[PDB]
Amino acid sequence: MLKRFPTPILKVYWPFFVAGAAVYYGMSKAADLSSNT
Amino acid sequence: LQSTLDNIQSARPFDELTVDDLTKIKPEIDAKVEEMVKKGKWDVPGYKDRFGNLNVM
Amino acid sequence: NDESILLLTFLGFTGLVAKYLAPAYKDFADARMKKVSDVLNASRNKHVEAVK
Amino acid sequence: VSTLIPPKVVSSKNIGSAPNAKRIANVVHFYKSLPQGPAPAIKANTRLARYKAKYFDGDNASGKPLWHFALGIIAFGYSMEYYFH
Amino acid sequence: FYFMNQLTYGFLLMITLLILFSQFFLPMILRLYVSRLFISK
């Protein structure tokens, strides 16, 4: 039914994780600087 | 061989066969999945040539 | 009401889907089921003939 | 000086190459399997399993469960919009 | 510019997609395909 298979978790998506960290940093820094709300 | 023919043709329907039965009968399919996942080739030759690809789009 | 016309329209597309998309998709899906069934029986036939 | 012995030498000789390779594959594939439709496991009622054995069953799986889900969603959304709008 | 429940939650959810689906669903679709292949030979 449900199979927990060992698949690449970050071996191929690691640049996507760096991009996600970058977008988190941008959202955090723009919450008061570029928000203007 | 006679027993193989007998239990091949007398029982074991295939439409209602479950994948778990195949996994418990033979575990080398799991090893094949490990080996083509680690090598990252999801299109090993001989996959849907004899089956239905049904590439709609 | 804006919310009156929307529910009626959604009922309309559900009826249209059941009228047109559901039968054609049903035939295509059943054809693919049948193809899988016959290739499974062909595999069984190959196995039993090889054993014979 | 002894003559060759084909039917006497069959211990090492198998059926070609492919047939003996697939003999092990086919002998056990038909051994440990259900005879005919054993263990249907149809009965299931755990809300999600209740849906599985009530409307989400694969025998028909038509648009009726989808329409019922949409009706429930819009029924909840009416109250949500009354609360909000 | 309020994006706490629109960006963070959606981002985490799409990590759940990228991980859980690629671990469970596409693998067992391919398992179906390779089991069909194996029984077909």
What CA–CA distance (Å, rounded) separates B21 from D34? 8
Look at E24 and A23 and tell me if their CB atoms are within 8 Å: no
Chain B nearest-CA distance from A12, in A, is 10
What does B6-47 look like in DSSP terms, one character per residue? HHHHSS--STT--HHHHHHH-SHHHHHHHHHHHTT-S--SSS
Q: Do chains D and A touch (3 or more CB pairs under 8 A)?
A: no
Residue B4: its chain C contacts at CB < 8 A?
51
Residue of D26, D63, D78 lying closest to C17 (CB–CB): D63
Residue D64 to residue C21: CA distance in whole angstroms: 14
- Shortest CA distance from A11: residue in chain B: B38
B2 vs B12: CA distance, rounded Å? 16
What burial letters (b/e) apply to B8-19, b meaning 16+ CB within 10 Å? beeebeeeeeeb
A18 vs E contacts (CB less than 8 Å) = none
Spatial separation of the C-alpha atoms in residues C47 and E39, rounded to whole Å: 9
Touch between chain E and chain B: 3 or more Cβ pairs under 8 Å: yes
CA–CA distance, E7 with A27 (Å, rounded to integer): 9
Distance (Å) from the alpha carbon of D62 to chain C's nearest alpha carbon: 8
Nearest residue to B10 (alpha-carbon basis) of D34, C49, C50, D26: D34
D32: Cα within 13 Å, side-chain hemisphere: 9
List of chain E residues whose C-beta atoms are within 8 Å of the C-beta of residue B26: 38
Residue at E6: amino acid letter: Q
| The dihedral sign for the CA sequence B43, B15, B20, D18 | negative
Are A8 and B40 a contacting pair, CB within 8 Å?
Answer: yes
